[PDB]
Design a protein around this motif. Structure first.
Motif, PDB file in Angstrom:
ATOM      1  N   UNK A 260       0.829  -1.199   0.000  1.00  0.00           N
ATOM      2  CA  UNK A 260       0.000   0.000   0.000  1.00  0.00           C
ATOM      3  C   UNK A 260       0.867   1.254   0.000  1.00  0.00           C
ATOM      4  N   UNK A 261       1.811   1.315   0.942  1.00  0.00           N
ATOM      5  CA  UNK A 261       2.709   2.464   1.017  1.00  0.00           C
ATOM      6  C   UNK A 261       3.559   2.558  -0.242  1.00  0.00           C
ATOM      7  N   UNK A 262       4.070   1.421  -0.717  1.00  0.00           N
ATOM      8  CA  UNK A 262       4.901   1.428  -1.916  1.00  0.00           C
ATOM      9  C   UNK A 262       4.141   2.001  -3.105  1.00  0.00           C
ATOM     10  N   UNK A 263       2.915   1.525  -3.329  1.00  0.00           N
ATOM     11  CA  UNK A 263       2.124   2.049  -4.432  1.00  0.00           C
ATOM     12  C   UNK A 263       1.745   3.503  -4.236  1.00  0.00           C
ATOM     13  N   UNK A 264       1.308   3.854  -3.025  1.00  0.00           N
ATOM     14  CA  UNK A 264       0.863   5.219  -2.765  1.00  0.00           C
ATOM     15  C   UNK A 264       2.007   6.211  -2.937  1.00  0.00           C
ATOM     16  N   UNK A 265       3.188   5.876  -2.414  1.00  0.00           N
ATOM     17  CA  UNK A 265       4.308   6.800  -2.499  1.00  0.00           C
ATOM     18  C   UNK A 265       4.745   7.056  -3.927  1.00  0.00           C
ATOM     19  N   UNK A 266       4.893   5.988  -4.715  1.00  0.00           N
ATOM     20  CA  UNK A 266       5.321   6.155  -6.101  1.00  0.00           C
ATOM     21  C   UNK A 266       4.277   6.908  -6.915  1.00  0.00           C
ATOM     22  N   UNK A 267       2.998   6.581  -6.724  1.00  0.00           N
ATOM     23  CA  UNK A 267       1.944   7.231  -7.498  1.00  0.00           C
ATOM     24  C   UNK A 267       1.925   8.726  -7.211  1.00  0.00           C
TER      25      UNK A 267
ATOM     26  N   UNK B  82       3.054  -2.613 -11.471  1.00  0.00           N
ATOM     27  CA  UNK B  82       1.922  -2.529 -12.382  1.00  0.00           C
ATOM     28  C   UNK B  82       0.595  -2.488 -11.649  1.00  0.00           C
ATOM     29  N   UNK B  83       0.463  -3.301 -10.598  1.00  0.00           N
ATOM     30  CA  UNK B  83      -0.757  -3.286  -9.798  1.00  0.00           C
ATOM     31  C   UNK B  83      -0.967  -1.921  -9.155  1.00  0.00           C
ATOM     32  N   UNK B  84       0.109  -1.323  -8.639  1.00  0.00           N
ATOM     33  CA  UNK B  84       0.001   0.003  -8.040  1.00  0.00           C
ATOM     34  C   UNK B  84      -0.452   1.035  -9.065  1.00  0.00           C
TER      35      UNK B  84
ATOM     36  N   UNK C 175      -2.018   9.872 -15.907  1.00  0.00           N
ATOM     37  CA  UNK C 175      -1.370   9.419 -17.132  1.00  0.00           C
ATOM     38  C   UNK C 175       0.146   9.461 -16.989  1.00  0.00           C
ATOM     39  N   UNK C 176       0.666   8.734 -15.999  1.00  0.00           N
ATOM     40  CA  UNK C 176       2.106   8.699 -15.783  1.00  0.00           C
ATOM     41  C   UNK C 176       2.766   7.975 -16.947  1.00  0.00           C
ATOM     42  N   UNK C 177       3.797   8.595 -17.513  1.00  0.00           N
ATOM     43  CA  UNK C 177       4.483   8.049 -18.684  1.00  0.00           C
ATOM     44  C   UNK C 177       5.655   7.178 -18.232  1.00  0.00           C
ATOM     45  N   UNK C 178       5.305   6.027 -17.665  1.00  0.00           N
ATOM     46  CA  UNK C 178       6.312   5.057 -17.264  1.00  0.00           C
ATOM     47  C   UNK C 178       6.939   4.407 -18.492  1.00  0.00           C
ATOM     48  N   UNK C 179       8.211   4.038 -18.362  1.00  0.00           N
ATOM     49  CA  UNK C 179       8.969   3.402 -19.433  1.00  0.00           C
ATOM     50  C   UNK C 179       9.373   2.010 -18.971  1.00  0.00           C
TER      51      UNK C 179
END
Length: 390
Positions: free
Chosen positions: A48-55, A77-79, A83-87
């Motif tokens: 949860x923290x990992x996804x929230x922080x990166x997003x 990917x789940x996090x 429209x973040x332009x991830x590579x």
């Protein structure tokens, strides 16, 4: 050649290129910036923290994310789905602008270094070869504010070694290989205080990036690009800073060019004197700039822009300034801003006349109703309160 096609994982439409192991930074830069029609900050992840922080960090910074193309990648990917332009470098559906290697790492690192060279701090977060790449990035690349994560494995061992007989215990937990691998760990102690281990993320990531950058003007110039005044106030401005003379004026001008009310308020709290800040040349340059207004068209009805033309057009519509707030507010309302003008109205004295002038100007500017009603009602409320008092 070959490949050079975009596939949509139906959708999450994305572009894909099957580049070779050897890559040219110019080619990739042109493809991403121009061919793909695609940041101030750069982030790359090795896994949860990992996804929230990166997003939160990616959305606020608007930074490209480098992650493994092959579906730790699944966790990211789940996090993103949450429209973040991830590579993606490797075929995850979430990632966009896929780049592949024909068999890679060396070309990717060269491209990242070339991109960073262009006027862009790069921070890599990591959740046996993991420590190798960590040390390579920390030593070879001067900038590498790598942060360890709570996730067990190589990251856990690296964090335990950095935090702290003990060497023998660490070597035993690792299981000749341990003895050879500890050579890098020896340099980790010397490299400490440069890569800070995360503790149980967007705020932490920003703090780590600021520490890596390492001079209030220099840090504040990059902070303005991120629009994080509320959080950056504690770190950028602290008691005992240097505050070089003259950089504050440039920072104030840069903030004023853009619409950052919070930063202007913070600078005023710092002691930005508008009595001396006001300048004829600065005002002329501010009027000239078109970055971030219909005044130009009005100018055609009325090349460098001078105060005389502004006065002429104002009259048609209707060396320090002793009361610069009048000029500031008239400029702000003339530029169609809805926040800076209100702040200048709040600060300046004789609010009734300024509010009435702004209300009159707003109606003719469009030739609107919301802004005109606001200015008109503010004046009415001000008079009503004064009427009650005396």
């Amino acid at each position: 050649t070959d490949a050079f096609g975009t596939i949509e994982f139906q959708s999450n439409k994305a572009m894909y290129v099957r580049v070779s192991f050897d890559t040219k930074p110019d080619l990739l830069l042109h493809l991403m910036t121009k061919e793909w029609q695609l940041p101030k900050l750069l982030i790359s992840v090795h896994g949860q923290v990992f996804g929230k922080g990166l997003i939160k960090a990616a959305m606020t910074t608007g930074a490209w994310i480098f992650t493994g193309g092959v579906n730790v990648i699944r966790h990211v990917g789940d996090a993103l789905k949450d429209k973040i332009c991830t590579i993606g470098i490797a075929l995850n559906s979430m990632h966009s602008h896929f780049i592949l290697a024909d068999n890679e790492v060396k070309l990717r690192r060269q491209l990242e270094k070339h991109i960073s060279l262009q006027k862009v701090p790069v921070v890599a977060l990591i959740v046996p070869n993991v420590i190798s790449i960590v040390l390579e990035y920390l030593r070879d690349t001067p900038p590498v504010p790598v942060v360890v994560c709570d996730g067990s494995g190589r990251a856990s061992d690296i964090l335990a070694f950095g935090h702290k007989s003990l060497r023998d215990q660490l070597l035993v937990t690792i299981q000749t290989q341990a003895q050879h691998l500890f050579i890098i760990l020896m340099e980790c102690m010397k490299k400490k205080e440069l890569i800070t281990v995360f503790r149980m993320i967007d705020l932490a990531i920003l703090t780590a990036l600021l520490k890596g950058a390492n001079s209030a003007p220099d840090q504040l110039s990059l902070a303005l690009a991120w629009n994080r005044v509320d959080i950056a106030r504690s770190q950028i401005f602290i008691y005992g800073q240097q505050w070089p003379v003259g950089s504050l004026e440039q920072a104030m001008l840069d903030a004023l060019v853009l619409d950052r009310v919070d930063f202007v308020k913070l600078l005023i709290e710092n002691g930005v004197s508008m009595h001396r800040f006001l300048t004829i040349s600065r005002l002329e340059e501010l009027y000239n700039t078109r970055h971030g207004n219909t005044l130009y068209h009005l100018v055609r009805d009325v090349y460098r822009i001078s105060l005389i033309d502004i006065g002429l057009v104002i009259e048609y519509l209707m060396n320090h300034f002793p009361f610069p707030f009048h000029e500031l507010m008239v400029w702000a309302v003339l530029m169609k801003r809805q926040k800076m003008a209100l702040f200048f109205w709040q600060h300046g004295e004789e609010a009734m006349a300024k509010a009435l002038v702004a209300c009159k100007l707003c109606k003719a500017m469009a030739h609107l109703n919301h802004n005109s009603r606001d200015f008109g009602q503010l004046a009415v409320e001000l008079l009503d309160q004064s009427y009650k008092q005396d």
